[PDB]
Structure formats: C-alpha cells, structure tokens
Amino acid sequence: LMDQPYSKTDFLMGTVVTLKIYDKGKEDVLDKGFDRIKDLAAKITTSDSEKTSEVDKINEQAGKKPVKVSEDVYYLIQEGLKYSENSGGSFDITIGPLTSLWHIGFSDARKPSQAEIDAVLPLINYKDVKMNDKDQTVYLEKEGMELDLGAIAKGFITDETLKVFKENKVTTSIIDLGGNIYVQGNNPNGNKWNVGIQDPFSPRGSVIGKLPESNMSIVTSGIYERYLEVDGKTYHHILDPKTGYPFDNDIAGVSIVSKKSIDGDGLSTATFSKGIKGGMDYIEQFEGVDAIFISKEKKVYETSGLKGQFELTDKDFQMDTL
Ligand SMILES: Cc1cc2nc3c(=O)[nH]c(=O)nc-3n(C[C@H](O)[C@H](O)[C@H](O)COP(=O)(O)OP(=O)(O)OC[C@H]3O[C@@H](n4cnc5c(N)ncnc54)[C@H](O)[C@@H]3O)c2cc1C
Ligand SMILES: [Mg+2]
Ligand SMILES: [Mg+2]
C-alpha cells in the first residue's frame, strides 16, 4: 500500500468524479474504472443532445415497441422497479416526463404551468414498465412515458466501478462520484476511512462531521445542491409524482450508509418523501442500512445502527434524538 495514491479526476455526468487507488502497481486500473463509468453513463443518460442512449431509445418507443437493452441497463431498470414498488410509488423511475419538464439543475430549468404538470402526472406509473427476461427488452406501455434513472444510476455505477477494482485485485481505494462515495479497505495507516458527512447548507465538499467507515458506501441527498429559484420560491430536484412539485418537509439532507451503493442511492427518494421521523422509521426496516438525517433547523439524527458513531464538528448543528 502507498501513502500517496494514484488519483485521477474528470468531470462526468455533470459533476467532478475522482478515483483513488492505494495499491502499488495498479495505476492503470484508474483508466479501467473511468472507462467503465463512461460506458455506463452513455447507456443511461438522457442529457446528451447528440446521442441516443439506451434509456432514450426506450422512451422514444413508449407505447410503440419493446426495446432491446444490454445487461447493464436491464439490471438497473430491474432494481429501479423494485425500489419503486417498495416505496409505494413515491420513488418512481417513470417520473421521466415530470423531471424532464422541470429540468431542475440545468441551464433551462423552468417552473411549468399547472396544465403542463397535469398533462404528465397520468404518465407516471412504474407498473407500466413491461419487462421480458428472455428477449431482454424493456417496454413502456403508454405513449409519452419516460424513464429517469438518475436517482439510482450513480449508485449502480459506483458498485460497478468497485467490481472493476476488485477484478483487478485492488484492495484499498476511494470512489467519489459526487454525492456517491465508496471507501474500500482502510486508510494505509490502519485507521478506518473518515468519511465526511455533507453539509446540506454548503457546497459539495463542506462537511458537518466525520463517520469512520470501511468497505462501505455513503450516498447523500439534499435540497440546496440542485434547485430552481423563481419569484422568491425555490424548487429542489426531488419531485412528488402525485403532485408534480418537490417533496417539502423537514429534511435538508440525508446520508445513507450501506454495503452496496445502489441500495443507499435507491432508498434515498422514498426516505426523503417521509420526512425526518418517517424517513428514520423507513431506514430502520432495512437491516444493514443506516442514515444520518439533517433537519432544516440544523438538527442531526442517527438511526439505530449508527448511534454514537458520527463525530459532529460543525457547531452550527446540534445532535438530537427522537
Ligand atoms: C448518467 C447520468 C448523466 C448525467 N449527465 C448530466 C449532464 O450532462 N449534465 C448535468 O447537468 N447533469 C447530468 N446528470 C445529473 C447530475 O449527475 C445530477 O447532479 C444528479 O443526477 C442528481 O442526483 P443526486 O445523486 O445528486 O441526487 P439523488 O437524490 O440521488 O437523485 C435525484 C434525481 O432523481 C430523479 N428524481 C427526482 N424525483 C424522483 C422521484 N420521485 N422518483 C424517482 N426519481 C426521481 C431526478 O432526476 C433527480 O435529479 C447526469 C446524471 C446521470 C445519472
Ligand atoms: Mg444519487
Ligand atoms: Mg439516490
């Protein structure tokens, strides 16, 4: 193990992505990881105007014909439908027509008319995604439907990047997709990795404390990173499929701790829709998954499996219990 790692930084999927590898003689695995990230991003994205991704092709043929997909895309949609059903529909990967309408976080973000919202709300239904295992096809049964895998894609890509690392016998690494972090092994000095818990009121990178972890994923969601401000009001990017407007409760941010990044990524939307106390109860039903909640009043809460582990450092915030 090296003290100073091999590291590479790129700007993919609209954010800074950094990979670090501490195993001596594994520098070329950095390129293998970024190759895998770019491969999956091109299959999943709906934000490339000059190319038609696999998800784009599914959306173009909604209500027309099933679309052949690769194993990566078939699996991601498979899991997205599982998180959608488990959420009761609060999380729904068919929210595509609504999230494309607002386009929150992009240069052309817009608050749509109520008539525009009412036109896309009947299109959101995860049960209308028809899957054929033998043909490996995905079919949107209704015209106008659109998939949006943005809430689970980074977790899946993070897991697949770790798979490339493990296949190359990498033992000590840090995968940072911006809001999706996986720490592999321990610090070369023997300590657990001190993972920073994002400050939801400050730009990405600023933290309110540290969580020691090893071989674990930490995924972050918040309201102040991607939002649109019009006429005094702000609208964050986590939208309610039943109303067409953002989920507005007492959560400012939440960090979900899990063995697999797709699980923490996929559980975030349903957890977010339930507020602080309801979201904590939701996380307590998943063994091996825990979370740190941060209120709009700067109160910090730990689920049962994380009690006493989080090291709060920002004095603007206070630890609180239920
Ligand atoms: C493959 C890919 C390519 C991208 N390319 C670009 C790019 O070129 N330019 C750019 O500016 N951004 C791009 N992005 C978006 C960028 O990565 C965002 O910062 C990020 O996707 C926001 O998600 P999050 O993980 O930070 O938060 P999360 O909470 O994990 O994800 C929130 C996202 O999930 C979706 N969502 C919202 N409400 C719901 C709901 N109720 N149910 C289900 N899903 C919901 C929306 O897409 C929302 O943005 C891309 C994203 C992906 C996955
Ligand atoms: Mg995410
Ligand atoms: Mg997520």
TrEMBL record:
Mg(2+) 1 binds at A151, D265. Mg(2+) 3 binds at A151, D265, T269. ADP binds at S90, D92, D148, K154, H237, L239. Mg(2+) 2 binds at A151, D265, S268. Its cofactor is Mg(2+); Mn(2+). It is a lipid-anchor. SUPFAM superfamilies: ApbE-like (SSF143631). Pfam families: ApbE. Mg(2+) binds at A151, D265, T269. It catalyses: L-threonyl-[protein] + FAD = FMN-L-threonyl-[protein] + AMP + H(+). The keyword Nucleus does not apply. Magnesium. Can also use manganese. Gene3D superfamilies: ApbE-like domains. AMP binds at S90, D92, D148, R226, L239. The keyword Secreted does not apply. Its EC number is 2.7.1.180. ATP binds at S90, D92, D148, K154, N180, R204, S221, R226, L239, T269. GO terms for cellular component: plasma membrane. It is an enzyme of class 2 (transferase). Keywords: ATP-binding, Cell inner membrane, Cell membrane, FAD, Flavoprotein, Lipoprotein, Magnesium, Membrane, Metal-binding, Nucleotide-binding, Signal, Transferase. Belongs to the ApbE family. This is FAD:protein FMN transferase. It comes from Listeria monocytogenes serotype 1/2a (strain 10403S).
